[model samples]
Target chain A: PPYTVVYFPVRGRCAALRMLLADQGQSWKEEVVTVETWQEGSLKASSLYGQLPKFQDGDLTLYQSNTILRHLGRTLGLYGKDQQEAALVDMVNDGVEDLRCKYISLIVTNYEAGKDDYVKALPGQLKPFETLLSQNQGGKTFIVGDQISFADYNLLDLLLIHEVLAPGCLDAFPLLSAYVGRLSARPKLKAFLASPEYVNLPINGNGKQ
Target chain B: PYTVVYFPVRGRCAALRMLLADQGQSWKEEVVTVETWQEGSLKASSLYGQLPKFQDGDLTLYQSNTILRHLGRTLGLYGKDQQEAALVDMVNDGVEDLRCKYISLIVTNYEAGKDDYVKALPGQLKPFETLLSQNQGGKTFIVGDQISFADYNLLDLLLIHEVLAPGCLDAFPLLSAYVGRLSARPKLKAFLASPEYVNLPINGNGKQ
Candidate 1:
């Protein structure tokens, strides 16, 4: 395989990239690191930033989820049509990352105590993406340009996980609702979403939604 | 004007300012004072409801990193090729991870978290040193021979970390020398010493 994904069994950070690879019909190897294996300290010590979702493209090793996404976006011609659209793609992806960070904190750090406040603040957090979509071709197309950039994959994953976290969360945002449905209906992606690999794994590591 | 709409502090925009200055690209600062920001109009109008909104010609962008990258892309500060660009992103991402923790400590948990954060500082700073060691034997820039956008951001991260934990880089010779080498650039050195940068608090809340 030309690409390899090293991560835990959970769909936590690697979900979007995995979806990208699956949708693109790219073959890759999965190097699953069990909790026991991770606790031995060598892998963690060798990790670039002491983190997971370590990726390898043949001999080119990389870390950081967004970096990997951007690398794939660059090499696969999924960034955008030009520089301007590429920047927009980056902006959307950065926004997605900001919200994803908040979601992760909620799931990992303070779920029980922070869920209510987080839920209350969810719409405000989500509205930005909705607004971005509305401004671009009335949300009929991808997040940035007419093409399907890496941000769409990441944003789709974000929206899916949010839906799991707060059912009916997208009810108020018709564009996002349609956007999710539209992206989810892509044949390859739809199949991957329903496959055993995606279905059996938890969305997060801590057994939280 | 290549305009930057941000708070008076250097919080997220310092490296960008340094980049523009070092590159000799003129820009304007549309400083958003705390009182003015409380008016909520700007916040509501902002795309991401955040500061550091950047404008170049007609295109407006949000998110500090996005702005840096846009400038990097347009100004040819990214890297030489695809591989170098990916490495640049990797470096920038690592800088951003450490910066987020630094912000959390300074803004949210300064009183309680400062001690532990300082104690663990070496472990956090080691990766950059290791990265430098791996690349060109710690002789050149963070990612490649040329100074990419990540270098500016990493420089800012290192300078601020030294302020937070004095002598934090003494143990890491590569990082110490890297900071000295980058900061010695004439325009950046001037910018670092200027009152525009010197007078402002590092954090919005006046911590550090």
Candidate 2:
């Protein structure tokens, strides 16, 4: 395979890029590390930041999930049509990352205690993606431009997973709701999402959601 | 002039501000007052409910790292090639990881968190030290011979942490020398010495 992903068995951070790869018709390998293997040694220490979702493409290797996404975006020409759009794409990705960080904090440490406050503020968090969608053809198109970028996959993952986190979270944001519906309906992505491969895996490690 | 709308503190904009100053790019600052933040007027208008909002000509942007990456992309300060760009991103993400922890310490009660933060500072700082050690004999720059945006961020991160925990870099000779070398650059040296950067508090809450 030209690309190889090293992550835990759970989807977690790798879900967006996994969808991006499958939707783009890219072939890759997965090197799954279980909790026992990760804690045993060497593997954890060898990681760039002691985190998973490490990626390798031919000779070049990467550590961060977003870095891998951007690299794939660069190599695959899915970043944007032009420089301005590229910045917008990056802005969207960063925004998604911000929310994802909060989500991770909630899931990893305080899901039991933080659930109420998090769900309450969930609408405020999801509004930015809706706003981005509105700016670009009122959610008729990708977050940045008419064409799809890696950010769309990231945002889709963010929106879908948030809905899982807080049921009916996107009800208020019509743009985001329609945006999720539209992106989720893409032929390849739709097939991938429904496949047993994707359905069988947990979205996160802890099984909270 | 380019406009950077942020809190009066130097929190997120420090690196980009340093880059702009070093590059001799004149820019203006739009300081959002604490009273205004409390009123929620400016926050309501913000794109992502955050600060370090930047505007360049007709282009308005939010997210400090995105703005930094944009400036890096615009100024040709990213890296030489695809491989180097990946390395740059890796270095930047590492910086961001430490910065997030730093922010948590700052916002959540620095005095209480200070000992724990300092105790673990070596593990946090070692990766960058390792990154430098592997490239060009722990010299040249963070990613390459030329300065990338990560270098600016690493510089600011090191400088601030040194203030937070004095002699934090003593154990790592490479990081110690790297900081000294980057600080010696003419424009950056002057910029560091300037009252504009010197006078500003690091955190908006006045913790650090």
Please report the candidate that would top lDDT against the real structure.
1
Model 1, CA-based lDDT: 0.92
| Clash number for candidate 1 | 0
TM-score of 1: 0.99
lDDT of 2 by residue, B18-115 (tens): 89988889999888988889898788988987797899989989988888888999898988987888889889988998999999999986888899
DockQ of 2: 0.75
lDDT of each: 0.92, 0.88
Chain A only: give the TM-score of model 1: 0.98
Candidate 1 i-RMS (Å)? Answer: 0.6
Clashing residue pairs in all predictions, respectively, total: 0, 0
Q: What would the per-residue lDDT of candidate 1 be over residues B1-208, giving only the tens digit for each residue?
A: 6999999888899999999989988888888888999999999999889888999998999999999899899889998999999999999989999999999998899999999999988999999999999888898899877989999999999999989888999999899999999999999888889888899888889887
Go through the candidates in order and give each one's DockQ: 0.87, 0.75
Between which residue pairs do clashes occur in model 1? none
- TM-score per candidate, chains pooled: 0.99, 0.98
